[PDB]
């Protein structure tokens, strides 16, 4: 009568076998989710790169534009001086 | 008189200023275009961030689930270990 212990062992052993099985399902499900995340992450790095390229292009072009505004400001100065002198006549 | 040299310096300056205006027009077009390219890539990334977080949620949920199931399995293992001792004692 001390082998109800046997039945207890059987029950526990199947409970474990059932968990193991479920764990197998969650594992291959976890693999599929991690691959989808990994892919999106890579896509995100890529986008970061495109963004950087467009921003750096803008910064560069901005540099050009500030210089050109300096040059233009100077020509405007010389235009102002020459037209004052001209009017002096 | 001197006013011939002036009318000429004015012609030259008006010519240079004009040219720079052109250069500036070109630079500003490429600028507005680059900013727009940027805005588009930032919108595309935003959409991508949304998807990325959804996949992260799914992955987290699976992960939580797996630790859940491993815990349970460890609780059953605690039981099986006890019965195995009580059993081996006979």
PDB file of C-alpha atoms in Angstrom:
ATOM      1  CA  UNK A   1       0.000   0.000   0.000  1.00  0.00           C
ATOM      2  CA  UNK A   2       3.090   2.140  -0.130  1.00  0.00           C
ATOM      3  CA  UNK A   3       3.107   2.283  -3.868  1.00  0.00           C
ATOM      4  CA  UNK A   4       0.510   4.892  -4.309  1.00  0.00           C
ATOM      5  CA  UNK A   5       3.907   6.421  -4.448  1.00  0.00           C
ATOM      6  CA  UNK A   6       4.259   4.734  -7.816  1.00  0.00           C
ATOM      7  CA  UNK A   7       1.125   6.487  -9.078  1.00  0.00           C
ATOM      8  CA  UNK A   8       2.475   9.797  -7.742  1.00  0.00           C
ATOM      9  CA  UNK A   9       5.678   9.233  -9.691  1.00  0.00           C
ATOM     10  CA  UNK A  10       3.771   8.434 -12.895  1.00  0.00           C
ATOM     11  CA  UNK A  11       1.652  11.567 -12.544  1.00  0.00           C
ATOM     12  CA  UNK A  12       4.613  13.842 -11.911  1.00  0.00           C
ATOM     13  CA  UNK A  13       6.586  12.270 -14.779  1.00  0.00           C
ATOM     14  CA  UNK A  14       3.823  12.964 -17.273  1.00  0.00           C
ATOM     15  CA  UNK A  15       3.300  16.421 -15.977  1.00  0.00           C
ATOM     16  CA  UNK A  16       6.901  17.061 -16.740  1.00  0.00           C
ATOM     17  CA  UNK A  17       6.650  15.444 -20.134  1.00  0.00           C
ATOM     18  CA  UNK A  18       3.784  17.668 -20.942  1.00  0.00           C
ATOM     19  CA  UNK A  19       5.663  20.774 -19.830  1.00  0.00           C
ATOM     20  CA  UNK A  20       8.752  19.751 -21.818  1.00  0.00           C
ATOM     21  CA  UNK A  21       6.522  19.393 -24.881  1.00  0.00           C
ATOM     22  CA  UNK A  22       4.943  22.823 -24.354  1.00  0.00           C
ATOM     23  CA  UNK A  23       8.424  24.230 -23.918  1.00  0.00           C
ATOM     24  CA  UNK A  24       9.350  22.899 -27.314  1.00  0.00           C
ATOM     25  CA  UNK A  25       6.440  24.783 -28.811  1.00  0.00           C
ATOM     26  CA  UNK A  26       7.369  28.054 -27.107  1.00  0.00           C
ATOM     27  CA  UNK A  27      10.944  27.575 -28.202  1.00  0.00           C
ATOM     28  CA  UNK A  28      10.359  27.367 -31.892  1.00  0.00           C
ATOM     29  CA  UNK A  29       7.908  30.218 -31.442  1.00  0.00           C
ATOM     30  CA  UNK A  30      10.495  32.272 -29.683  1.00  0.00           C
ATOM     31  CA  UNK A  31      12.944  31.559 -32.495  1.00  0.00           C
ATOM     32  CA  UNK A  32      10.477  32.915 -35.066  1.00  0.00           C
ATOM     33  CA  UNK A  33       9.910  36.058 -33.009  1.00  0.00           C
ATOM     34  CA  UNK A  34      13.491  36.752 -32.421  1.00  0.00           C
ATOM     35  CA  UNK A  35      14.196  36.440 -36.122  1.00  0.00           C
ATOM     36  CA  UNK A  36      11.499  38.999 -36.879  1.00  0.00           C
ATOM     37  CA  UNK A  37      12.885  41.352 -34.342  1.00  0.00           C
ATOM     38  CA  UNK A  38      16.419  40.894 -35.537  1.00  0.00           C
ATOM     39  CA  UNK A  39      15.324  41.673 -39.076  1.00  0.00           C
ATOM     40  CA  UNK A  40      13.458  44.825 -38.069  1.00  0.00           C
ATOM     41  CA  UNK A  41      16.474  45.910 -35.981  1.00  0.00           C
ATOM     42  CA  UNK A  42      18.699  45.602 -39.016  1.00  0.00           C
ATOM     43  CA  UNK A  43      16.235  47.543 -41.087  1.00  0.00           C
ATOM     44  CA  UNK A  44      16.373  50.206 -38.396  1.00  0.00           C
ATOM     45  CA  UNK A  45      20.150  50.479 -38.488  1.00  0.00           C
ATOM     46  CA  UNK A  46      19.885  50.871 -42.211  1.00  0.00           C
ATOM     47  CA  UNK A  47      17.441  53.686 -41.828  1.00  0.00           C
ATOM     48  CA  UNK A  48      19.690  55.349 -39.327  1.00  0.00           C
ATOM     49  CA  UNK A  49      22.334  55.294 -42.013  1.00  0.00           C
ATOM     50  CA  UNK A  50      20.104  56.863 -44.651  1.00  0.00           C
ATOM     51  CA  UNK A  51      19.088  59.521 -42.207  1.00  0.00           C
ATOM     52  CA  UNK A  52      22.720  60.305 -41.475  1.00  0.00           C
ATOM     53  CA  UNK A  53      23.513  60.599 -45.135  1.00  0.00           C
ATOM     54  CA  UNK A  54      20.702  63.042 -45.758  1.00  0.00           C
ATOM     55  CA  UNK A  55      21.519  65.069 -42.673  1.00  0.00           C
ATOM     56  CA  UNK A  56      25.207  65.291 -43.537  1.00  0.00           C
ATOM     57  CA  UNK A  57      24.308  66.357 -47.032  1.00  0.00           C
ATOM     58  CA  UNK A  58      22.202  69.099 -45.569  1.00  0.00           C
ATOM     59  CA  UNK A  59      24.931  70.250 -43.175  1.00  0.00           C
ATOM     60  CA  UNK A  60      27.469  70.370 -46.003  1.00  0.00           C
ATOM     61  CA  UNK A  61      25.136  72.300 -48.298  1.00  0.00           C
ATOM     62  CA  UNK A  62      24.384  74.632 -45.389  1.00  0.00           C
ATOM     63  CA  UNK A  63      28.104  75.335 -45.056  1.00  0.00           C
ATOM     64  CA  UNK A  64      28.197  76.254 -48.757  1.00  0.00           C
ATOM     65  CA  UNK A  65      25.176  78.493 -48.314  1.00  0.00           C
ATOM     66  CA  UNK A  66      26.646  80.443 -45.402  1.00  0.00           C
ATOM     67  CA  UNK A  67      29.804  81.112 -47.292  1.00  0.00           C
ATOM     68  CA  UNK A  68      27.904  82.233 -50.344  1.00  0.00           C
ATOM     69  CA  UNK A  69      25.896  84.583 -48.132  1.00  0.00           C
ATOM     70  CA  UNK A  70      29.151  86.028 -46.803  1.00  0.00           C
ATOM     71  CA  UNK A  71      30.448  86.675 -50.329  1.00  0.00           C
ATOM     72  CA  UNK A  72      27.090  88.136 -51.344  1.00  0.00           C
ATOM     73  CA  UNK A  73      27.040  90.384 -48.290  1.00  0.00           C
ATOM     74  CA  UNK A  74      30.387  91.688 -49.301  1.00  0.00           C
ATOM     75  CA  UNK A  75      29.369  92.438 -52.875  1.00  0.00           C
ATOM     76  CA  UNK A  76      26.355  94.209 -51.415  1.00  0.00           C
ATOM     77  CA  UNK A  77      28.730  96.317 -49.328  1.00  0.00           C
ATOM     78  CA  UNK A  78      30.741  97.314 -52.396  1.00  0.00           C
ATOM     79  CA  UNK A  79      27.495  98.068 -54.242  1.00  0.00           C
ATOM     80  CA  UNK A  80      26.402 100.355 -51.435  1.00  0.00           C
ATOM     81  CA  UNK A  81      29.715 102.236 -51.384  1.00  0.00           C
ATOM     82  CA  UNK A  82      29.879 102.653 -55.146  1.00  0.00           C
ATOM     83  CA  UNK A  83      26.317 103.913 -55.364  1.00  0.00           C
ATOM     84  CA  UNK A  84      26.952 106.456 -52.614  1.00  0.00           C
ATOM     85  CA  UNK A  85      30.008 107.665 -54.399  1.00  0.00           C
ATOM     86  CA  UNK A  86      28.158 107.789 -57.667  1.00  0.00           C
ATOM     87  CA  UNK A  87      25.381 109.920 -56.227  1.00  0.00           C
ATOM     88  CA  UNK A  88      28.066 112.301 -54.999  1.00  0.00           C
ATOM     89  CA  UNK A  89      28.132 113.564 -58.587  1.00  0.00           C
TER      90      UNK A  89
ATOM     91  CA  UNK B   1      34.911 111.500 -66.093  1.00  0.00           C
ATOM     92  CA  UNK B   2      35.466 109.411 -62.983  1.00  0.00           C
ATOM     93  CA  UNK B   3      31.808 108.633 -63.364  1.00  0.00           C
ATOM     94  CA  UNK B   4      32.564 106.282 -66.238  1.00  0.00           C
ATOM     95  CA  UNK B   5      34.750 104.139 -64.067  1.00  0.00           C
ATOM     96  CA  UNK B   6      31.992 104.104 -61.506  1.00  0.00           C
ATOM     97  CA  UNK B   7      29.269 103.172 -63.953  1.00  0.00           C
ATOM     98  CA  UNK B   8      31.516 100.295 -64.818  1.00  0.00           C
ATOM     99  CA  UNK B   9      32.397  99.132 -61.361  1.00  0.00           C
ATOM    100  CA  UNK B  10      28.646  99.113 -60.876  1.00  0.00           C
ATOM    101  CA  UNK B  11      28.206  96.937 -63.974  1.00  0.00           C
ATOM    102  CA  UNK B  12      30.794  94.497 -62.674  1.00  0.00           C
ATOM    103  CA  UNK B  13      29.387  94.334 -59.181  1.00  0.00           C
ATOM    104  CA  UNK B  14      25.886  93.914 -60.463  1.00  0.00           C
ATOM    105  CA  UNK B  15      27.257  91.077 -62.464  1.00  0.00           C
ATOM    106  CA  UNK B  16      28.987  89.292 -59.608  1.00  0.00           C
ATOM    107  CA  UNK B  17      26.054  89.718 -57.231  1.00  0.00           C
ATOM    108  CA  UNK B  18      23.866  88.213 -59.949  1.00  0.00           C
ATOM    109  CA  UNK B  19      26.057  85.216 -60.365  1.00  0.00           C
ATOM    110  CA  UNK B  20      26.130  84.549 -56.600  1.00  0.00           C
ATOM    111  CA  UNK B  21      22.401  84.800 -56.560  1.00  0.00           C
ATOM    112  CA  UNK B  22      22.388  82.027 -59.034  1.00  0.00           C
ATOM    113  CA  UNK B  23      24.807  79.941 -56.995  1.00  0.00           C
ATOM    114  CA  UNK B  24      22.627  80.617 -53.973  1.00  0.00           C
ATOM    115  CA  UNK B  25      19.449  79.564 -55.808  1.00  0.00           C
ATOM    116  CA  UNK B  26      21.126  76.271 -56.657  1.00  0.00           C
ATOM    117  CA  UNK B  27      22.334  75.740 -53.100  1.00  0.00           C
ATOM    118  CA  UNK B  28      19.007  76.452 -51.604  1.00  0.00           C
ATOM    119  CA  UNK B  29      17.234  74.005 -53.912  1.00  0.00           C
ATOM    120  CA  UNK B  30      19.599  71.219 -53.033  1.00  0.00           C
ATOM    121  CA  UNK B  31      19.140  72.176 -49.394  1.00  0.00           C
ATOM    122  CA  UNK B  32      15.339  72.094 -49.401  1.00  0.00           C
ATOM    123  CA  UNK B  33      15.599  68.822 -51.316  1.00  0.00           C
ATOM    124  CA  UNK B  34      18.021  67.289 -48.821  1.00  0.00           C
ATOM    125  CA  UNK B  35      15.821  68.363 -45.911  1.00  0.00           C
ATOM    126  CA  UNK B  36      12.852  66.709 -47.630  1.00  0.00           C
ATOM    127  CA  UNK B  37      14.862  63.529 -48.192  1.00  0.00           C
ATOM    128  CA  UNK B  38      15.656  63.648 -44.522  1.00  0.00           C
ATOM    129  CA  UNK B  39      12.020  64.144 -43.459  1.00  0.00           C
ATOM    130  CA  UNK B  40      11.026  61.158 -45.560  1.00  0.00           C
ATOM    131  CA  UNK B  41      13.604  58.906 -44.038  1.00  0.00           C
ATOM    132  CA  UNK B  42      12.580  59.976 -40.615  1.00  0.00           C
ATOM    133  CA  UNK B  43       8.999  59.116 -41.347  1.00  0.00           C
ATOM    134  CA  UNK B  44      10.009  55.756 -42.758  1.00  0.00           C
ATOM    135  CA  UNK B  45      12.021  55.075 -39.608  1.00  0.00           C
ATOM    136  CA  UNK B  46       9.061  56.034 -37.428  1.00  0.00           C
ATOM    137  CA  UNK B  47       6.935  53.441 -39.147  1.00  0.00           C
ATOM    138  CA  UNK B  48       9.778  50.989 -38.729  1.00  0.00           C
ATOM    139  CA  UNK B  49      10.101  51.804 -35.026  1.00  0.00           C
ATOM    140  CA  UNK B  50       6.477  50.938 -34.551  1.00  0.00           C
ATOM    141  CA  UNK B  51       6.958  47.510 -36.138  1.00  0.00           C
ATOM    142  CA  UNK B  52      10.198  46.955 -34.208  1.00  0.00           C
ATOM    143  CA  UNK B  53       8.496  47.498 -30.863  1.00  0.00           C
ATOM    144  CA  UNK B  54       5.629  45.242 -31.733  1.00  0.00           C
ATOM    145  CA  UNK B  55       8.082  42.419 -32.473  1.00  0.00           C
ATOM    146  CA  UNK B  56       9.833  43.218 -29.225  1.00  0.00           C
ATOM    147  CA  UNK B  57       6.593  42.867 -27.345  1.00  0.00           C
ATOM    148  CA  UNK B  58       5.870  39.509 -28.917  1.00  0.00           C
ATOM    149  CA  UNK B  59       9.411  38.344 -28.137  1.00  0.00           C
ATOM    150  CA  UNK B  60       9.138  39.567 -24.542  1.00  0.00           C
ATOM    151  CA  UNK B  61       5.803  37.797 -24.113  1.00  0.00           C
ATOM    152  CA  UNK B  62       7.179  34.502 -25.390  1.00  0.00           C
ATOM    153  CA  UNK B  63      10.144  34.946 -23.187  1.00  0.00           C
ATOM    154  CA  UNK B  64       7.986  35.570 -20.131  1.00  0.00           C
ATOM    155  CA  UNK B  65       6.017  32.520 -21.027  1.00  0.00           C
ATOM    156  CA  UNK B  66       9.100  30.340 -21.265  1.00  0.00           C
ATOM    157  CA  UNK B  67      10.320  31.386 -17.838  1.00  0.00           C
ATOM    158  CA  UNK B  68       6.854  30.708 -16.590  1.00  0.00           C
ATOM    159  CA  UNK B  69       6.886  27.199 -17.892  1.00  0.00           C
ATOM    160  CA  UNK B  70      10.387  26.522 -16.674  1.00  0.00           C
ATOM    161  CA  UNK B  71       9.331  27.630 -13.200  1.00  0.00           C
ATOM    162  CA  UNK B  72       6.378  25.259 -13.205  1.00  0.00           C
ATOM    163  CA  UNK B  73       8.650  22.471 -14.437  1.00  0.00           C
ATOM    164  CA  UNK B  74      10.993  23.230 -11.535  1.00  0.00           C
ATOM    165  CA  UNK B  75       8.084  23.020  -9.098  1.00  0.00           C
ATOM    166  CA  UNK B  76       7.129  19.630 -10.425  1.00  0.00           C
ATOM    167  CA  UNK B  77      10.784  18.697 -10.230  1.00  0.00           C
ATOM    168  CA  UNK B  78      10.692  19.577  -6.579  1.00  0.00           C
ATOM    169  CA  UNK B  79       7.868  17.127  -6.127  1.00  0.00           C
ATOM    170  CA  UNK B  80       9.395  14.352  -8.210  1.00  0.00           C
ATOM    171  CA  UNK B  81      12.614  14.764  -6.222  1.00  0.00           C
ATOM    172  CA  UNK B  82      10.722  14.274  -2.943  1.00  0.00           C
ATOM    173  CA  UNK B  83       8.777  11.223  -4.109  1.00  0.00           C
ATOM    174  CA  UNK B  84      11.981   9.770  -5.490  1.00  0.00           C
ATOM    175  CA  UNK B  85      13.623  10.029  -2.061  1.00  0.00           C
ATOM    176  CA  UNK B  86      10.610   8.608  -0.211  1.00  0.00           C
ATOM    177  CA  UNK B  87      10.529   5.861  -2.841  1.00  0.00           C
ATOM    178  CA  UNK B  88      14.215   4.944  -2.736  1.00  0.00           C
ATOM    179  CA  UNK B  89      13.837   4.550   0.987  1.00  0.00           C
ATOM    180  CA  UNK B  90      11.849   1.374   0.424  1.00  0.00           C
TER     181      UNK B  90
END
